[PDB]
Design a binder for this molecule. Structure first.
Ligand code: SRM
Ligand code: SF4
Ligand SMILES: [K+]
Length: 464
């Protein structure tokens, strides 16, 4: 298992050229796959090239996690904050936390984020430990801590569940690393290590109580949490296209379907990004939506970058729906896949696009995700509409998450095929288009209209 460490998704152009060369010359599939934890993956590395890949990473200052005994995963950071000035400091903290957590064997893998409101692109409620940035005058002052998210479930096993993360309170910036260590060590000591399916922090928190866990974190960190400082999210999508950054700089976010970077007929996505890497003055940022930001472009350089991106297919226009849809890798490389996800999503969203147009809502979107099995890598258990693989061509259909990702969708129909899913969604999108209140999301609508009951307390009410 290769898990390349890349805190906050920030990768230099020199690093990009090295991984582009390795992908093209030394793997079966020839691709760079952007992951939804803001890093990248190679597929099909032969025996001959396992030592070459660690040497390649080392040659450009990169390393991979030693997953055999390191339970941490890549630390996420909001990639393109609306207050652009905040990114540098939030990224420095994501790096500091990532380095602090490098090898305490944990009972189960442990996932961390740094989040900049109002964007929940990094999907904080899928993660064990979340630092929500609070700023004054463009400078970080501290974080709200949320603990205990995680999405993996087992079909037919009501002792497993997806759980969102719980607020603990606010900490000043100076206590960040002491708090991070206290959460990690409390989970290390209190986790149910014997039953692997019950070892995640989400289960520990439910077993001992949020207040009990919080009190122990306070004791170990040597602090008292302050009350939560106000924060609100407005969405989880990327900002596709150009946005103004700091100074005279601009950020170009490229939609990349499934994060799969390969040269396709009339669409040389991989060569295009190499050509951009060779001229770009700044870094790239891999987003938690499996897209890529060409970050820190001077205004004078926008036209040159955009020319390559447009000619290579990297700026091919897609619907808002497609920009807000996601799938996990699944087949052909994942050994755990029950149904296709990545290879299913493009034509599935073709069909969803037709339904949206039919009902007059082609400018709207529904956060819609497909995961190939209930481990949940595609983050379907935080979607407005989630599909969870069950068997070849068959999925459980979940409804009633929200746009900002703070609610788990309940299962609506079990073990159904794509035609059955599209027939259900045709009827329901039609109802939404005609009956929604101003700005009301599809997920919230299915709850308000009584189509599905909400999940209010997942450890107790996720399962019917
Ligand atoms: C690539 C990625 C999906 C994607 O399309 O982007 C992915 C792919 C895989 N995940 Fe994951 N996971 C990916 C994000 C996630 C997330 C979402 C997230 O973290 O934001 C989850 C759900 C959140 C959570 O952990 O609760 C996730 C939960 C899992 C689990 C279930 C863990 C559990 O608690 O039970 C497994 C299975 C396991 O660990 O045994 C897993 C296992 C796998 C493996 C390695 C399958 C395996 O054990 O052999 C997958 C490799 C497929 C392949 O061929 O490449 N992956 N995986 C993501 C890589 C992120 C990264 O860079 O580290
Ligand atoms: S959700 Fe299942 S099928 Fe998809 S990548 Fe994760 S483990 Fe593989
Ligand atoms: K994408």
């Amino acid at each position: 298992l290769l898990r390349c460490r890349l805190p906050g998704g920030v990768i230099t152009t020199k690093q990009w050229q090295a991984i582009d060369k390795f992908a093209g010359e030394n793997t079966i599939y020839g691709s760079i796959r952007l992951t939804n934890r803001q890093t990248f993956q190679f597929h099909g590395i032969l025996k001959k090239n396992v030592k070459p890949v660690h040497q390649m990473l080392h040659s450009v200052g990169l390393d991979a996690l030693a997953t055999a005994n390191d339970m941490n995963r890549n630390v996420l950071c909001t990639s393109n904050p609306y207050e652009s000035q905040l990114h540098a400091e939030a990224y420095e903290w994501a790096k500091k936390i990532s380095e602090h957590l490098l090898p305490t064997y944990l009972p189960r893998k442990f996932k961390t984020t740094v989040v900049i409101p109002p964007q929940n692109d990094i999907d904080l409620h899928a993660n064990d430990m979340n630092f929500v940035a609070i700023a004054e005058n463009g400078k970080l002052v501290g974080f709200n801590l949320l603990v205990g998210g995680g999405l993996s479930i087992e079909h037919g096993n009501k002792k497993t569940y997806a759980r969102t993360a719980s607020e603990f309170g606010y900490l000043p910036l100076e206590h960040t690393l002491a708090v991070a260590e206290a959460v990690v060590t409390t989970q290390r000591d209190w986790g149910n290590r014997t039953d692997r399916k019950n070892a995640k922090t989400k289960y520990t928190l439910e077993r001992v109580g949020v207040e009990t866990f919080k009190a122990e974190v306070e004791r170990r960190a040597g602090i008292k949490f302050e009350p939560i400082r106000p924060y609100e999210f407005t969405g989880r999508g990327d900002r596709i296209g150009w946005v103004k950054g700091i100074d005279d700089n601009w950020h170009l976010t490229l939609f990349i379907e499934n994060g799969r970077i390969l040269d396709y007929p009339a669409r040389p996505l991989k060569t295009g990004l190499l050509e951009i890497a060779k001229i770009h003055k700044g870094d790239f940022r891999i987003t938690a939506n499996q897209n890529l930001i060409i970050a820190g472009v001077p205004e004078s350089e926008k036209a040159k970058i955009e020319k390559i991106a447009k000619e290579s297919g990297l700026m091919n226009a897609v619907t808002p729906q497609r920009e807000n849809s996601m799938a996990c890798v699944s087949a052909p490389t994942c050994p755990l896949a029950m149904a296709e996800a990545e290879r299913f999503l493009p034509s599935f969203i073709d069909n969803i696009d037709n339904l949206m147009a039919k009902h007059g809502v082609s400018d709207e979107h529904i956060v819609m995700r497909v995961t190939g099995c209930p481990n949940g890598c595609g983050r379907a258990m935080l979607a407005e509409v989630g599909l969870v693989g069950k068997a070849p061509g068959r999925y459980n259909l979940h409804l009633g998450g929200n746009r900002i990702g703070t609610r788990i969708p309940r299962m609506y129909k079990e073990n159904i095929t794509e035609p059955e899913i599209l027939a259900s969604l045709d009827e329901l999108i039609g109802r939404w288009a005609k009956e929604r209140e101003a700005g009301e999301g599809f997920g919230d609508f299915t709850v308000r209209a009584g189509i599905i009951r909400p999940v209010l307390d997942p450890a107790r009410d996720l399962w019917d």
